[PDB]
Amino acid sequence: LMKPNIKRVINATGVVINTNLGRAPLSKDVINFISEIANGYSNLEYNLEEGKRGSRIAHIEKYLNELTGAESSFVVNNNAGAVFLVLNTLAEGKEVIISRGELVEIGGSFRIPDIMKKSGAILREVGTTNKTKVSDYEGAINQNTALLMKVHKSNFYMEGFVEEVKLEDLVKLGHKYGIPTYYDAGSGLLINLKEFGISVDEPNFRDCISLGIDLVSGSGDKLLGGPQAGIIVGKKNLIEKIKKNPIARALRIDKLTLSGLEMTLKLYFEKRYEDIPVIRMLTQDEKALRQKAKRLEKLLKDIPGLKISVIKDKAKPGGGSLPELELPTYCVAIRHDRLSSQELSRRLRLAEPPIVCRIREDQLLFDMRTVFHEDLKTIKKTLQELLSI
Amino acid sequence: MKSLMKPNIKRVINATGVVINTNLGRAPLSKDVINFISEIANGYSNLEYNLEEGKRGSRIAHIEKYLNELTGAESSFVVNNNAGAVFLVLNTLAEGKEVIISRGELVEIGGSFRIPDIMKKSGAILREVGTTNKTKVSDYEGAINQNTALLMKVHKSNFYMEGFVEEVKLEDLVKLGHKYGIPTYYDAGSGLLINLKEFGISVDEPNFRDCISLGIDLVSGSGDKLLGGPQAGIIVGKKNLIEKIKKNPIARALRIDKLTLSGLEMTLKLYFEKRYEDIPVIRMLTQDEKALRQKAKRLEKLLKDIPGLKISVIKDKAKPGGGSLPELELPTYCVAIRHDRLSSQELSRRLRLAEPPIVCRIREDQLLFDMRTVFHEDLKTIKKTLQELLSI
Ligand SMILES: [K+]
Ligand SMILES: [Pt+2]
Ligand SMILES: [Pt+2]
């Protein structure tokens, strides 16, 4: 093979946070900065003022602190690690209370009880799958309770007869017994969504911090729309213990992500949301989508055996973050006389660049939500090369 | 006390359009059944007797024949309620032993019923496997050991999950159980008797016959849910196991009453006779869309003459099963009413205080009557009830 296996793939699934397709894409502004810091040497671990070594995370935490309002903050390889670290540091040998309904598998390799076991912490599971009350948490408190933990169900959701302990209650319960409260938000949403005209209950750092939760973690590649990372924020007392754990060194973030992260956080401090693609995509205007949808169909009419439509559909745009959410978008629907849709999808994934699309009832769909403007021309040229042969 | 001069349990007209309603008494009974119940209650009977042999007999006997035939299990048994069945199954086969179950199937149904809580009081030992959202065969098999007494699956009747989710195919469980020689218990909960797709309602909901022929060793369910009968815990399965269960002294504490046994038998006989329309819970879920409309405009016809009354007829998607089919979404015709003098919040409040009461849905200060759960004899009574409240 002359070719590298890692390829740019055209996402037509209309799924913005896609665990399979590389999660959050990055803004050209961020990547340029990353590219700059990677092209030569730098002040990675250095103080230019004093002429000696300095802490790498230092640059970042300041932003996090003022953005989230938490006393201190830290960042490690990924949220998986965040969880592992937080547990291993605070709960080794001791008991961590958690709802039977928040023991989650995210991805293929991550399971709360599995990482938790490996951490050295002792799982104490309370309540039921579908309903969990405050009593259940309190009931399970004892001498060896180190931690009150909540995990946000980022990849799935429950409906029907359902209950859940209000975080406030959890903070309350924590304060009573003097037990720290750890919240794995996971989506790493930085700020309240309702500020962008998207009304959702999705917990963010800032808000769940000001709720009095002692520790909150999340990924950087999800709702934060940054590079992969485990983000931790909370009580300085705690973060301090965390940083000091030798394991934290094995979880230490790389130069690239660090740079990538800091640029991302600058954008947020400067309130330039449109400049982080996950946010832009999820707040894209319903008109902007039809405008894109029709723009593509204009390029598709001239090719043979091709049936082009454009529909309006309720999709669930956030894959690994906002599972409940349903938003309307415009899909460009296409069909060929000679080829079944399943056969076409298969060829599209094998194309260069590959094209991954949603199928509905033997009707091949491209959801514009997650398609770029530079992608359109490339789908034309890629469709004709397969079908005009 | 003053409120003692009259009974508190009253008939109540349900306009919530919610067929299986935990609050409003669950499944109503057909008059055929009620008559039969009334007949066996009115005097003495063969309850525990063998008229052939002139000596005492099992009460369950009457019923077991029907269940065994309908579901295709070797033997069957009936206790007070499904909670009890679950309690009894576990206390019989798993006391002091381990029961493997998915972390996603540890349910709270009702306020007072929690699998892990009752399983504990059961004497059984809970070995929970997998995760909330995803559970694989691996999880089940990996937790098997010397003290493993049971592989258990509980059907999520009152809630459901969406997103990244995994579940073990029943077939694989059975295959896993046959491998290690461990019995498999399915708490269906819904006690649905026959496949729903036969009535034009396409859903995955498990039924007795189908889950038995798949090689599950024990299946239980409620009587007053999708079975459309009176309250009961129904167990069907392998004779060797039913036997062990029947002999548990606790099963006498859970022994069913003359009334439900009667009601149950007639209910089942209706199933044998394939007269589904004569069991309200199935009739109400299988009602034709036209029929609902037909019924909705026949109501509107009666209410036009009432002063201050604005009346429309809408078409809406509702969720008819409360405690059995939470996913199921079905279209129905509601009859919507509005008054100029009374707020709908105040009008609903008065309707519940009526004789007979009337419970309906409220949506943005508009009052909804869902035709799904309204009987034909109830229309007239809604007219007379409204005019009495509004005119007076
Ligand atoms: K890294
Ligand atoms: Pt009283
Ligand atoms: Pt009195």
From Swiss-Prot, chain A:
<keyword id="KW-0963">Cytoplasm</keyword>
<keyword id="KW-0711">Selenium</keyword>
<dbReference type="InterPro" id="IPR015421">
    <property type="entry name" value="PyrdxlP-dep_Trfase_major"/>
</dbReference>
<dbReference type="Pfam" id="PF03841">
    <property type="entry name" value="SelA"/>
</dbReference>
<comment type="function">
    <text>Converts seryl-tRNA(Sec) to selenocysteinyl-tRNA(Sec) required for selenoprotein biosynthesis.</text>
</comment>
<keyword id="KW-0648">Protein biosynthesis</keyword>
<dbReference type="InterPro" id="IPR018319">
    <property type="entry name" value="SelA-like"/>
</dbReference>
<dbReference type="InterPro" id="IPR015424">
    <property type="entry name" value="PyrdxlP-dep_Trfase"/>
</dbReference>
<dbReference type="GO" id="GO:0001717">
    <property type="term" value="P:conversion of seryl-tRNAsec to selenocys-tRNAsec"/>
</dbReference>
<dbReference type="GO" id="GO:0001514">
    <property type="term" value="P:selenocysteine incorporation"/>
</dbReference>
<keyword id="KW-0808">Transferase</keyword>
<keyword id="KW-0663">Pyridoxal phosphate</keyword>
<comment type="similarity">
    <text>Belongs to the SelA family.</text>
</comment>
<comment type="pathway">
    <text>Aminoacyl-tRNA biosynthesis; selenocysteinyl-tRNA(Sec) biosynthesis; selenocysteinyl-tRNA(Sec) from L-seryl-tRNA(Sec) (bacterial route): step 1/1.</text>
</comment>
<dbReference type="GO" id="GO:0005737">
    <property type="term" value="C:cytoplasm"/>
</dbReference>
<dbReference type="InterPro" id="IPR004534">
    <property type="entry name" value="SelA_trans"/>
</dbReference>
<dbReference type="GO" id="GO:0042802">
    <property type="term" value="F:identical protein binding"/>
</dbReference>
<feature type="modified residue" description="N6-(pyridoxal phosphate)lysine">
    <location>
        <position position="222"/>
    </location>
</feature>
<dbReference type="GO" id="GO:0004125">
    <property type="term" value="F:L-seryl-tRNA(Sec) selenium transferase activity"/>
</dbReference>
<protein>
    <recommendedName>
        <fullName>L-seryl-tRNA(Sec) selenium transferase</fullName>
        <ecNumber>2.9.1.1</ecNumber>
    </recommendedName>
</protein>
